[PDB]
Subunit: 323 residues, 6 copies
């Protein structure tokens, strides 16, 4: 079939692989070395001939690029447009100076040009490194992910059993607190017979223990609400939400109202109590929740969310909400 | 008359059976074997050369299709387009990657293409088997559909008598908990003299004990609200709502406000208390309920819904709400 | 004048009588026999070669039409279009499968075609028989319309005197509970010197005891709100509302706020308490009531409605609300 | 100046007196006799060869016109169109069957044509006689306008003094309760030095005791809100509102909020308490009051309206609200 | 520079001075004599050959103009159009019968034509005389502006000191209660070093004691909200609002929320308590205050407004609100 | 690279330096001398041949320019247009008399022309001097910035430690109270390893102690909400908001809800308590907060804002809110 399938794809690939090849070389030429460094969480460039790299250990390391052709306005701009076209977008110095796109491999890329930047020789770039690895849950314990908890044993058992029985779990914290990583590891506890549908922004979750599943990705005209709506039409046993933004916000509250099996998602929030308000706020912004009391949404999630895990800047659990 | 009627239909049938014949062969060529398997509730394909079939016993069974022409991008895409055109829709890799359509027989079909799927060799397909069969209510008892209830005898009598007297009943639970099946069986108790109008999404309910009736189907530009609106203009004794979504939501609250005879419908909800909120939420989203207090809607259904039956993942009643 | 008036009308009549003659024959050809049967409340056809007729005694009687040219897709469709054009509408298998129109004499007609019906050989038709007769109020007593009441004498006097003094009365119940019939009879008690304006959907009320009056009919672009608005500009002593739908809903609350003489209308509602909420709900849907508290509307009608009469499925009063 | 002014007006008058002369003859030809009858409050025609005339004594008197050319469809329609064009409007059997216009002298006219009327030989007409006369206030007392009050002397003094000091008074009751008449008479008490601006729908108020004043009339594109807005820019001492409808409703609440001198207007309402709600309801419908608590409006008028006079169907005061 | 500046202005002046010269002569020809009369607050013409002039002493004086060419429809109309064009507007007998414009010197002018007036020989005109004089504050005391107060000394000191320290003061009352005049006089107490920006409708305030300042005028497409928005970008020490209308209403509440130095403005209101509600009402009408509780606005101004001065029809303070 | 980068920029620079060179000379010709004066906070021109300059010591100093070509309508207008085009805007005497732009160096400029100004020889100009200097925090103490506090030592330690630990701080006060200056100095306490993103209106903050950072500027079509949205996608450790206006208002409440590290921004407000309401008001105006209770927002910031510093007109802290 590979022979018949190749000719069939031939036309779309040429199309895609015409904006993707260019982008790969730009990517290679500029951030190549950087993308190969182990244990890094973000590659920033501040349009000042210096590349700042953030390590998993929360340290910022700078690198001198004053002497590289790759970091020339012409070279940087070409890279920028390559990202734009790749995601069917435009970046310029007028109506589109700020950009959000991805690399060939899918890593989030945020580019900012003049006039939004201080001057015309400034081109801000921020690459988000998904930290491609799937550490086992045991590894989290061995490293004391739960050491700050007073209910350590309880928490470690609740996460194992809870998830195994299909409770709705929410993992929250700040950008880069290892939220995704954590959920990826705790998935070892979903019975391998479960069908799982994952809705993400960029491929990140890996299915090491499950065969039956499907991954959905929102982006462009396809909102996350579309993927979660499709999801509910694909007979899922577990639904894994890459991250609650605002669109799905309310359509997630509903999925929960209909008493749905095992949900699991990440959210930016400083705490448990916060997570509930974060949810209400978000859900409220939806036109469908235009006639529902605000406190009524908060109490809504309060009944539906079985357990919340918060993670601090030190990639350690500092609160384990239950029941 | 059949002779005159044939020539009369001739032109629409040619039109329809021009998108339906193509679709039948595609359907036959790919999921034929699968659609013939007994006691299955869903046929999923995850674009990975393996067909996953869900059995009534809640088990997932996979099937190797690596060696079939039918499962080639070209073969799969043709099938996909066949579903699209059949329901007057389009499926593509741009503005219409997600699709909701039906088979020749009416079974719900959910197709997802790239870019929404992980890659371009992935084509997600989910067929919903309306488990074709009409088991007698007695069969439900023999199998202990009510065994978890503490008010078993009470419940089994309430459902028989209640329905016979025209109470408004709501059957709820998760996808595939046998809600439809249950309502089809409990219909044995509606006096055969009753005129029944059924509003569904796909033909599913069967009228084994009733002669005078009519089936309405919403889809496309015809919303369910249109069918329920027409319904109230067709002198019905009993109204059977395939499933409360959101459109009818409020227009259902009203049908109840006007003190209407015997209503009976299914709804996704984890419990009794939940069902009332599920209802309010939904009704609220309607512009007509823009000036009605939210708690006022909840109390609204609370007075109008005489009895609620909830079903767990094990296709067993685990709560029988009454009065 | 009849001579000059004839030539004057000549042009509109030809126009109307060009869609009305066709419709009369279709009507005659199909439901002729049926429309001549005494004491029937609805003529239904379920696209199955059988005509179901509902008798005043709540019984459904079926009739075999397998052997009639009139009931051929071609014959049924022609009838359907005749109804459509008659009311300046279209009925088809695409954007207009559901239809609401009337017969030459004005009886409500609801037609449903494929795709909304189960198949293409199904054409649903529901004719509503106004039950053309004006029984005296005494006849209602002789038949025990009030026998279920504990306050029988009280109720029978309240309706007589109340109406005679101009109180606002609301008659409610389900479709075909003899609401219209009832109001028609209790009109014997409005002083014959009263000027009455009636706003209906189809001519039904008869003025046996009153000379000075005028009938308004809404339909098409003319909403009932338009007729009630005109009404208040025609110096009426009594206003008879065919039936509260939703448009007039709020503009009716107002007519009452301005302390208006004798109002009398029908409404679908299961009870007294219900009728008040039914009213609030409806009024609320109006943009003019966008800034008025929902409970404030309920209390609104509670002060204004002097007496409510409810009728059960057995065409008997089972609640007589007063003061 | 009359010579120069004539040539100046010549062009508009020709324009106006081209639709007004035709209308005068029609008016003369049909309702001539009727318009000359003394003490009548409304001339109704129900499209049945009979003209119904309402006398000031609340009696309905009918007149046989079967034998008059004037009452022929052709003759009636010409009259109808004459009213339409006169007010720059259209009346027809399609998009404009209902009409609201005026006669040459300004009397309100309500015409209804088929399809809104029962048949095509029916043409409903309702003329409102502004009972042309300005009876002295003393005459009201002599006739016992206040005889039903327990606080007779109090009330009669309050109305005299109150109005003389500039209190905000509201006269309310049903159509034809002599509200306008009453206000016209109580104007004898406004110091003759007061500048008065009157906002009406049709000229009706007469200034027997005042020289400095101006009359504003709303109609067509000029809403009453425009006339009250202009009013507040014409240095008025007293403002007389023909009748509170809904536009001015809120813009009237404001005029009062700014603590304005002497206001006086009529409103349809059954009582005092009702009048306040009638006001709130109306004010609320204005976009400017979109963010104001409903009960807050009621309390608003409650502080601002110093005294309310209600009149029953018998043209007698049956409630005199004060302070 | 005057030489270079003249040529530069030459083109705009010709443009303006082409609609302004015509208007001056019309103004001169008609209301000349009248505009020269001392101590008058308004010049009204009621289209009846009589000019009514209001004196500062609250007296209305009429003047016979039957024998003047100036008061001929042709002469009056020309004047009317002159005002219209001057402010870039149109006045006619159709879509623009009501007019608001100004004279060459800026005095407010309100013109009303037929159909809004009673007949075609009626042309209503109302000129508002700013009363061009700047009496000292002491003069107010000598005349007993504060004599009705029980806290006389207190009030007279509070106004002096308060204003000197930059408190937010609101002067309110009815049209022509000498509000503007009052504020103009109390400005003697703002330290001469203060920079003041004044936002008015027409030039009226005079800066007798201040050198550093700027005057803003709203009108036409430039709303007062625009001038107050610009104001906050011109480093003002004191802001003087000609008069709170509704646009600035909320944008004024905000200026106060940001704890702004010395504000001072006039508002139409009957009292202190009223002034706060007047403010809330107005602010609420702004889209920006769409999500803020109504009582929350009232309490808003209650904290921010340090002192309110009300003036009665007798140009005397009858309430001095403080703290 | 400078060689390749030059040719690359060549085309945009020519474009920009074509509106910027003209503007520099105008700026030089008129306000040159003035812009060179030390310790000044605003340069105002009131279209009266006198330039008013505000000194840091709160004193207003005027300067005679009657004898300068630069201050001639032609000379002033050319300057004005130069500012307009520079920011891609238009300034005229019709639809764009008010202008907000910047100088070559970025200083805020507010220009007002006739008709908005009193006459045609008036051209209002207000330049805001960003007092260019970065005084050390110690300098603030030496000058008694905290001397009015009863909790002096506490406050001075709280600001040092608080900021060092990443608390959310809000600095508020009136225009020119040295808010920006203060925040610039207290930045010495953010660990030099912290990545900082600053969102301003004009470049003002200076990074004396930090290497890794990026500056974002909103203006034109790029709102501040866009820069804060981009900000959260650039892995910041600290976010410095030039000033809360209204757009970011709610999108700032959210950034805080997600428990974000170290925020620090300025806001116009008279006090602590005020600052919370100022925040709520602003956030509410956002469509996303349309369904959130107003008091719920106030309580929102109350939990999230760790410490608020208010500054009086005398550039001294007069309230130090904490916890």
């Amino acid at each position: 079939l590979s022979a018949e399938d190749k000719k069939f794809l031939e036309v779309e690939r040429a199309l895609k692989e015409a904006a993707l090849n260019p982008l790969r070389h730009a990517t290679e030429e500029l951030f190549g070395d950087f993308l190969k460094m182990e244990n890094i969480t973000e590659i920033c460039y501040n349009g000042n001939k210096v590349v700042w790299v953030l390590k998993n250990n929360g340290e910022w390391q700078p690198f001198d690029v004053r002497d590289r052709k790759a970091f020339s306005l012409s070279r940087l701009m070409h890279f920028a447009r390559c990202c734009a076209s790749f995601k069917k977008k435009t970046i310029d110095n007028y109506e589109n100076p700020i950009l959000s796109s991805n690399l060939a491999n899918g890593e989030r890329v945020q580019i900012v040009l003049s006039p939004v930047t201080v001057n015309d020789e400034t081109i801000s770039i921020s690459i988000r490194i998904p930290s491609k690895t799937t550490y086992p849950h045991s590894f989290f314990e061995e490293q004391g992910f739960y050491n700050l908890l007073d209910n350590k044993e309880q928490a470690i058992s609740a996460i194992k059993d809870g998830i195994a029985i299909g409770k709705n779990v929410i993992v929250c914290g700040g950008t880069g607190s290892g939220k995704t990583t954590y959920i990826k590891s705790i998935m070892e506890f979903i019975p391998k017979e479960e069908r799982i549908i994952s809705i993400e922004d960029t491929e990140e979750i890996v299915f090491k223990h499950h065969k039956n599943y499907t991954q959905l990705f929102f982006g462009g005209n396809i909102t996350s609400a579309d993927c979660l709506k499709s999801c509910l039409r694909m007979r899922p046993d577990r639904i894994i939400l890459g991250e609650l933004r605002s669109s799905e916000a309310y359509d997630f509250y509903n999925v929960l109202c209909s008493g749905h099996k095992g949900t699991l998602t990440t959210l930016h929030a400083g705490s448990s109590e916060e997570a509930f308000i974060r949810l209400a706020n978000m859900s409220s912004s939806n036109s469908a929740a235009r006639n529902i009391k605000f406190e009524s949404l908060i109490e809504g999630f309060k009944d539906l969310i079985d357990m919340i895990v918060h993670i601090n800047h030190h990639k350690q659990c500092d609160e384990f909400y239950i029941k």
